[PDB]
């Protein structure tokens, strides 16, 4: 009853060139590290011989199979030597979630090194597990958040701007969903209530996006790191992570989940579809005119979708939209954390209204 719980990664390290202090961070755990790395990252981001420069920590480097599946988690787990002191994940979301799962299975600390700032999952005590074919299988709730999250903003700036923008879409949802949970007194990912700190970090996330998002996008377009980019990477990773996990999820992510039932949306990134969920949720939950205008203006300036056509649903049928709404309103979905009672028809209507509003702003 009214008890809060806020969870955190142990250490969050961020800056241009931070990959160069990875050895120092691993050495705080011991002398043996098991590294799970994305193949593209090994060859094109760190360089195949990157670990040859280590002198204080012995690395067992293993190329990630590509899918965070129970099968891959089992395969990698069997390659870990007993004397291993720390597990490391370097790459995108699936690589990081796999590393978290392997560390959990072997009861070892984990260091998470995202090479893109495209979702707010890095700092979380969660791994999303898929079948070998890439279809969602289940959520693995972890007992501990990562011991270290290390973000090299120079590596992030060299990745395509599309990925930073998608991270801003995943982050954009944080305040709206956490605010709904705060109003509802809904539980967060721990089962207890969010703290004043969690809700304040979710609001800071949103304010940071509005103020620095465009400046950060201009920086990444030139593969450059500026303080504006640093603030947005921190917002997309640390603030958004804490805000969604300890503040809570609500309509936007449930709507994103419903959108996955339409195959035309599969080529779009998580954060791009979350943005559509956010916009629909502003109509659904009765936001005032100035707030709706503020969010659409932000999406327009950074290049997030504001219409169904922009996520591959140009001319989508009412029948297809109702499938999305029904999926979003599954009894176990987060949309029920909204203070208002929500039915599928309400979501269907909000998606259509949000789309029409976005199209008219764009003179379509
Ligand atoms: Cl989020
Ligand atoms: Zn998300």
Write up what this structure looks like.
The PDB classes it as oxidoreductase. Keywords: glycerol dehydrogenase, structural genomics, joint center for structural genomics, jcsg, protein structure initiative, PSI, oxidoreductase. It forms a monomeric assembly. It is globular, with a radius of gyration of 20 Å. The strands form two sheets. The protein has a six-stranded parallel β-sheet. Strands 6-7 form a two-stranded antiparallel sheet. Helices cover 49% and strands 12% of the residues. The protein has 364 residues and is α/β, with parallel strands linked by helices. It starts with 10 loop residues before the first strand and ends with a helix. It has two domains: 158 residues, Rossmann fold, CATH 3.40.50; 206 residues, Dehydroquinate synthase-like - alpha domain (Dehydroquinate synthase-like, alpha domain, Up-down Bundle), CATH 1.20.1090. The longest helix has 26 residues. The structure holds chloride ion and zinc ion (ZN). Chloride ion (CL) binds next to helix 6 and helix 8.
């Amino acid at each position: 009853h009214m008890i809060t719980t806020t969870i955190f990664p142990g250490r969050y390290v961020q800056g241009a060139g931070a990959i160069n202090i990875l050895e120092e961070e691993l050495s705080r755990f011991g002398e043996r590290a098991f590294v799970v790395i994305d193949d593209f990252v090994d060859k094109n981001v760190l360089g195949e011989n990157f670990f040859s420069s280590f002198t204080k920590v012995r690395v067992n480097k293993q190329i990630f199979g590509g899918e965070c599946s129970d099968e891959e988690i089992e395969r990698l787990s069997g390659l870990v030597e007993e004397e291993t002191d720390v597990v490391v994940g370097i790459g995108g979301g699936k690589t990081l979630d796999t590393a978290k799962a392997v560390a959990y299975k072997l009861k070892k600390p984990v260091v998470i090194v995202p090479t893109i700032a495209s979702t707010d999952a890095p700092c979380s005590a969660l791994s999303v597990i898929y079948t070998p074919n890439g279809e969602f299988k289940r959520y693995l709730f972890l007992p501990r958040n990562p011991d270290v999250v290390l973000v090299d903003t120079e590596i992030v700036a060299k990745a395509p701007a599309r990925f930073l923008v998608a991270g801003m879409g995943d982050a954009l949802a944080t305040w709206f969903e956490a605010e709904s949970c705060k109003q509802k007194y809904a539980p967060n990912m721990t089962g207890r209530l969010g703290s004043m700190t969690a809700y304040a970090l979710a609001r800071l996330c949103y304010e940071t996006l509005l103020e620095y998002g465009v400046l950060a996008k201009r920086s990444v377009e030139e593969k450059s790191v500026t303080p504006a980019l640093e603030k947005i990477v921190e917002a997309n990773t640390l603030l958004s992570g804490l805000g969604f996990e300890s503040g809570g999820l609500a309509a936007a992510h449930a709507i994103h989940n419903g959108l996955t039932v339409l195959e035309n949306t599969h080529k779009y990134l998580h954060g791009e579809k979350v943005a559509i969920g956010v916009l629909a949720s502003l109509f659904l939950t009765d936001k005032p005119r100035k707030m709706i205008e503020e969010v659409y203006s932000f999406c327009e300036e950074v290049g997030l979708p504001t219409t169904l056509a922009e996520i591959g649903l140009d001319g989508v049928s009412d029948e297809d939209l109702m499938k999305v709404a029904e999926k979003a309103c599954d009894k176990n979905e987060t949309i029920h954390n909204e203070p208002q009672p929500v039915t599928s028809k309400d979501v269907f209507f909000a998606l259509k209204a949000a789309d029409r509003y976005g199209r008219m702003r764009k003179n379509l």
